[PDB]
Amino acid sequence: AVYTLPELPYDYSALEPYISGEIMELHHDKHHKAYVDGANTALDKLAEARDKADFGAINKLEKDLAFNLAGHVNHSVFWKNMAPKGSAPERPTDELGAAIDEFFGSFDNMKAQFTAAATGIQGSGWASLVWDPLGKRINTLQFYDHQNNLPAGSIPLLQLDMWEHAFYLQYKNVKGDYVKSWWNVVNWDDVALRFSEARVA
Amino acid sequence: AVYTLPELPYDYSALEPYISGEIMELHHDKHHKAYVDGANTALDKLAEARDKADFGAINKLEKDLAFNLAGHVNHSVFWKNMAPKGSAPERPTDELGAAIDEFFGSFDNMKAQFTAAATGIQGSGWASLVWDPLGKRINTLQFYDHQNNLPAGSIPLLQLDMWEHAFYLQYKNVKGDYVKSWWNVVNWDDVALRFSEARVA
Amino acid sequence: AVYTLPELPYDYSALEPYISGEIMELHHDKHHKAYVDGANTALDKLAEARDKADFGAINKLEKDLAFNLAGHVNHSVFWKNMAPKGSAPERPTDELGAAIDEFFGSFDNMKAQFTAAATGIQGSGWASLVWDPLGKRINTLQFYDHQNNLPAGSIPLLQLDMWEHAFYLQYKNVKGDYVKSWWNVVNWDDVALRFSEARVA
Amino acid sequence: AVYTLPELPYDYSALEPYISGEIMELHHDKHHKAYVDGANTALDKLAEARDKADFGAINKLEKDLAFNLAGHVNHSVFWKNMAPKGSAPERPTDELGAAIDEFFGSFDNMKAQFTAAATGIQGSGWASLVWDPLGKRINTLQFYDHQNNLPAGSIPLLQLDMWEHAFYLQYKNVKGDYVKSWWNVVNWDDVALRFSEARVA
Ligand SMILES: [F-]
Ligand SMILES: [F-]
Ligand SMILES: [F-]
Ligand SMILES: [F-]
Ligand SMILES: [Fe+3]
Ligand SMILES: [Fe+3]
Numbered sequence A, B, C, D: 001a002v003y004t005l006p007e008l009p010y011d012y013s014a015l016e017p018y019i020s021g022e023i024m025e026l027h028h029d030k031h032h033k034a035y036v037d038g039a040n041t042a043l044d045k046l047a048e049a050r051d052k053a054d055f056g057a058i059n060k061l062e063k064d065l066a067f068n069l070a071g072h073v074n075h076s077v078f079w080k081n082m083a084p085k086g087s088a089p090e091r092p093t094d095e096l097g098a099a100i101d102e103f104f105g106s107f108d109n110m111k112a113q114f115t116a117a118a119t120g121i122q123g124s125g126w127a128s129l130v131w132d133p134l135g136k137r138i139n140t141l142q143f144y145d146h147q148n149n150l151p152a153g154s155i156p157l158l159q160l161d162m163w164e165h166a167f168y169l170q171y172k173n174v175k176g177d178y179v180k181s182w183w184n185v186v187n188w189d190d191v192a193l194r195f196s197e198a199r200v201a
């Protein structure tokens, strides 16, 4: 298949007590799997369309592709953006740390902006720290669903799933507590790597 | 400022009779300029939000940023994707040509899919040929407005503005004639360059 | 204020085992309450914008109003659309029953279409049975979030909340089991009343 | 057919010099016709889906229905909301006038808010004055495309098409001039009628 479901880089309960293993299991094994299958199906459907020269469902197929592929991309990044507390730095350092200070003033300012973007979403969405190739800078973006409200070429560095399935079983409606807890499991080493590789464009 | 309006790589009327110089002038000097101003303003507002520690308008600012920055990105690629008839080969060759055949079956199949995506948009949008870093392939996407219906990390290779301002003065409601004429001025050399730089990340 | 949170027409656990009392409590007391506060706030902000003659945040305010007011409208209808198993006929009758057969072929056909619309949503949304004043017919619509993918003037007759908070604590990712169970508590008398009042405009 | 294209209540050039007959012709004969055909096609497709118990394209069909039906509704109202200058009052009076003063403070405040909503749209959209059945009031809404950013049950009273096809041939990019000119042709008698009939819910 074109797209495949990546395995978690840690045990399902490795992020506890901040993120329950119950959510990690459903989220990865069920939700993420769905996006991979959906993205693959969209490509097969588009291939069939070209073969038969029948593009009647093009609008449907392009949304299916964008939605599912965006879901696959967002979650693939999401898993690696996390690590058991203590297994990674609690604050970004070196080049990443300097870059965050440069584009946000400080780590705290970045955190405040990122958190505000995360909790203010009207509907399903993501809070995302991305590398902007055109502006040569780090910005925060608020994705709607998986595939909306973002410029093409944006390279994700750090993402937070704000869909209700990501926190409801544990935090219920209190999205603020979920975000507060999530900061504890951010793998700043992974974000640093993405930054090093992202800034070549 | 962070973002600047790029000059056209050719005269305003260099794409005639395919795209009128009148549209080129309004499109570049008026429309594209607005996205640059809007993107810069959004960043300035976000900076102010951080200093005052008030993120009440975060939802508005994130959409202003995404909409305007995406407009800026899309049009910047758009201008470079075109060139006077005769300045470049009318068909992709070498690495790009082989990649199109691999991911679409043939050049014609790609054109058919891209055209269908372009003319079927319900509202404003773009037809886009992008490099998918995850699947390591070339896909067609159908953007809504400037910033919707696309996965993060998508690398734009070839884009076609389907907003009404891009063709109405010349083609009126006949979107098909606009797309058909547009193929005549596609700068495959620019697309080939974007493809080469995209494969390396 | 302009908008107020309507009380549930039954006890929080009156819909069990179909919909847990825990969900009913969070859904009504927390989620619905938030839309009421948000809708009132949006109007207050719009009033302030008029007094100060500054409409810089108009885009934000119009979306805040639409999102929150739509949330308020959707949930208000939602609560009334349900009732304890046994409080109303399990199948539409009289005028409503005849109308369903006319516009859908049969009750089963309607259920199938409504269910498909409910379970296929890509993101948050609603499955909705509405009265179309223009075509003078009953149609099914699939709302995105609370305020998207619907024609102005649509009269809601029967709505099903497909946002994850509406079913996750009980049904997890299995949306189909939620929809299936939901049919058991549909208050056809309320729907019949909305239909009668809708036909007269 | 279920939906039919209404004829204009005046000659195509009756709104000049404010709105050219060229736009009126294309807009009504081409654009509006498309929405009617599209809305009818969506219903036929949904009927076929129920017959064969095949709801695979439900997401596509529901968007096609919402988009096209919303376009049909919006334009049907739009045509009647206008009249040759001098054929209708230049300002709302009686019950409508009183209602506007009540919910906006004054006619001028309403105009300012409505105009701001019209010119600030990011993408295609509508500025709309609607009757809110739940709040028992008149509000302004900013529709995105034809079917987004509005609560169910909203009854349109006055609408302004802000899609580029509505003004580009005459006003180019200067949407402000289009809105300013449009106020001259508003048929306040039609809006008054809609208000009288709208407020019964
Ligand atoms: F997910
Ligand atoms: F543009
Ligand atoms: F809700
Ligand atoms: F139109
Ligand atoms: Fe998720
Ligand atoms: Fe453009």
Ligand SMILES: [Fe+3]
Pocket (backbone or CB within 6 Å): C027, C031, C075, C161, C163, C165, C166
């Ligand atoms: Fe809900």
Ligand SMILES: [Fe+3]
Pocket (backbone or CB within 6 Å): D027, D031, D075, D161, D163, D165, D166
């Ligand atoms: Fe229009």
